[PDB]
Amino acid sequence: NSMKNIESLFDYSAGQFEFIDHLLTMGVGVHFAALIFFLVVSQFVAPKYRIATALSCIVMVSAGLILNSQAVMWTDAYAYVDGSYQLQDLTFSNGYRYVNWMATIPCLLLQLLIVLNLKGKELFSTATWLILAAWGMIITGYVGQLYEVDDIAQLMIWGAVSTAFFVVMNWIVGTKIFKNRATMLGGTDSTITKVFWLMMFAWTLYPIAYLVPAFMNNADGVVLRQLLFTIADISSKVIYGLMITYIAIQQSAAAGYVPAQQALG
Ligand SMILES: CCCCCCCC/C=C\CCCCCCCC(=O)OC[C@H](O)CO
Ligand SMILES: CCCCCCCC/C=C\CCCCCCCC(=O)OC[C@H](O)CO
Ligand SMILES: *C\C=C(C)/C=C/C=C(C)/C=C/C1=C(C)CCCC1(C)C
Ligand SMILES: CCCCCCCC/C=C\CCCCCCCC(=O)O
Ligand SMILES: CCCCCCCC/C=C\CCCCCCCC(=O)O
Ligand SMILES: CCCCCCCC/C=C\CCCCCCCC(=O)O
Ligand SMILES: [Cl-]
């Protein structure tokens, strides 16, 4: 997993290396700061939607820990020798991000179905096919990135299969959204449409980072990839969670829940 990724192939100047480390540690503070927000505001959510904010708290920490682990692993592996940071130990890899995706993605999707006001049979059903679709996407994508150094052909083929799941996944998401927004309260039938387009954008940065080894196989591609993941993380997890929370609170007010009615006031 360490020799299979392109990061183990290049030396990095002090600028490139300190910039990556600063990206990873910044994502930590952003997520753990967001955690405190999602934690505090969960009281302003009616019980019907409160799980939606608790799932954001889980994502914030699941991502913050992996990011924090990525930073420490980033430093342990490289040592400044003769004007450039050089690989010293095989401990860094992007594979740990994919494991973070197996957990955060089901949490990001489940809280979307909760603000849409699904329940019972359809919730457990729609939730089962989206996760198995996301898992199939994450796994096929994990196998392909194991060849981002040896077999680029395999990366493409596995990337194609992973994209097949991605398309099917979003098709189910969009279908459920536009077939259930009329049920949403407080005027959130418009906000949920915006969250969807936020989804379609942020989630599409990952496959672009997945392909950086194919069109920019250099140290500046390693920096571009992490910069892409950083933009994607902050949008698919933080901003996405803020919109989900705003929707959760808004409907809580419309339903007559006072802590949300006084919070928005
Ligand atoms: C040889 C390797 C095997 C190739 C196979 C891997 C490719 C999978 C892609 C599409 C089919 C799977 C998706 C089919 C989804 C049908 C179920 C569904 O979508 O229903 C959900 C519903 O909208 C909510 O209740
Ligand atoms: C490896 C490449 C394989 C080929 C893949 C490339 C082709 C992509 C085509 C469509 C994307 C669909 C994205 C999902 C967009 C949301 C669709 C939706 O919301 O559902 C329709 C709705 O019911 C209407 O009102
Ligand atoms: C941290 C949050 C999320 C939603 C991570 C999401 C990742 C993806 C949607 C990755 C998608 C890929 C596809 C479409 C095909 C190439 C390989 C990937 C797994 C990177
Ligand atoms: C309520 C407080 C909100 C902010 C959360 C706490 C802020 C923590 C700040 C930095 C993250 C700590 C982990 C980064 C490690 C830095 C050293 C390294 O490069 O590995
Ligand atoms: C591969 C694993 C498939 C998982 C299937 C989906 C499981 C989702 C089950 C529900 C978890 C969230 C429960 C929150 C519901 C809130 C509504 C209520 O309070 O009754
Ligand atoms: C660690 C928990 C794993 C959970 C797996 C359950 C989800 C399975 C979904 C579809 C898997 C499709 C990927 C094909 C596997 C072959 C790739 C390989 O050889 O490693
Ligand atoms: Cl991530």
Write the DSSP string, 22-88.
HHHHHHHHHHHHHHHHHHHHGGGS-TTTHHHHHHHHHHHHHHHHHHHHHHHHHHHHEEE-SSSEEE-
> Longest C-alpha distance within the chain, in Å?
66
The b-or-e profile of 168-206 (16+ CB within 10 A means b, else e) is ebbeebeebbeebbeebebebbebbeebbeebeebbebb
CA nearest ligand 5 atom 8, residue: 124
Judge contact between 190 and 172, C-beta under 8 A.
Answer: no
Distance CA 150, CA 9 (A): 12
Compute the distance from residue 92 Cα to the ligand 1 centre, in Å.
34
- Indicate the angle between helix axes 188-210 and 95-115, nearest 10 degrees: 170
Judge contact between 197 and 219, C-beta under 8 A.
Answer: no
CB-hemisphere CA count at 13 Å for 22? 7
The residues near 164 (Cβ < 8 Å, ≥ 6 apart) are none
Distance CA 131, CA 111 (A): 13
Q: Give the tokens for residue 200.
A: 């379609």
Residue 185 has phi, psi (to 5 degrees) of -105, 170
Task: Choose among 208, 224, 222: nearest CA to 10.
Answer: 222
Measure CA of the first residue to CA of the last residue in the chain; give whole Å. 51
Compute the distance from residue 74 Cα to the ligand 4 centre, in Å.
15
Distance CA 148, CA 84 (A): 24
Compute the distance from residue 27 Cα to the ligand 4 centre, in Å.
9
Q: Give the tokens for residue 50.
A: 């409160």
Residue matched to tokens 């379609």: 200
Judge contact between 220 and 15, C-beta under 8 A.
Answer: no
Judge contact between 31 and 242, C-beta under 8 A.
Answer: no
- What count of residues does the chain have? 265
The b-or-e profile of 99-135 (16+ CB within 10 A means b, else e) is ebbeebbbbbbbbbbbbbbbeeeeeeebbeebbebbe
Burial of 139 (0-12, 13-18, 19+ CB in 10 A): middle
Judge contact between 221 and 94, C-beta under 8 A.
Answer: no
Helix (H) or strand (E) segment spanning residue 231: helix 219-233
Compute the distance from residue 170 Cα to the ligand 2 centre, in Å.
7
CA distances from 129 to 60, 61, 228 (A): 24, 25, 28
Mutational test site, ligand 6, from 1, 135, 147, 158, max ligand atoms within 8 Å of CB: 135
Compute the distance from residue 206 Cα to the ligand 3 centre, in Å.
5
Q: Give the tokens for residue 189.
A: 């039938």
Residues flanking ion ligand 7, Cβ below 5 Å: 97, 233
Query: Residue 183 gets which letter from DSSP?
Result: G
CA distances from 112 to 22, 118, 158, 241 (A): 31, 10, 28, 9
The residues near 171 (Cβ < 8 Å, ≥ 6 apart) are none
Task: Choose among 236, 245, 239: nearest CA to 97.
Answer: 236
H helices of 78-217, in order, are 95-115, 120-145, 152-178, 188-210, 212-215
Residue 104 has phi, psi (to 5 degrees) of -70, -40
Distance CA 84, CA 198 (A): 39
Task: Choose among 121, 109, 253: nearest CA to 188.
Answer: 253
Report the DSSP beta bridge partners of residue 12: 85
Report whether residue 197 contacts ligand 2, using a CB cutoff of 6 Å: no
Task: Choose among 62, 58, 67: nearest CA to 29.
Answer: 67
Report whether residue 186 contacts ligand 6, using a CB cutoff of 6 Å: no
Q: How many CB atoms lie within 10 A of CB 153?
A: 9
Per the rule left: phi > 0, alpha: psi between -120 and 50, beta: everything else, 117 is left
Structure-solving method: X-ray
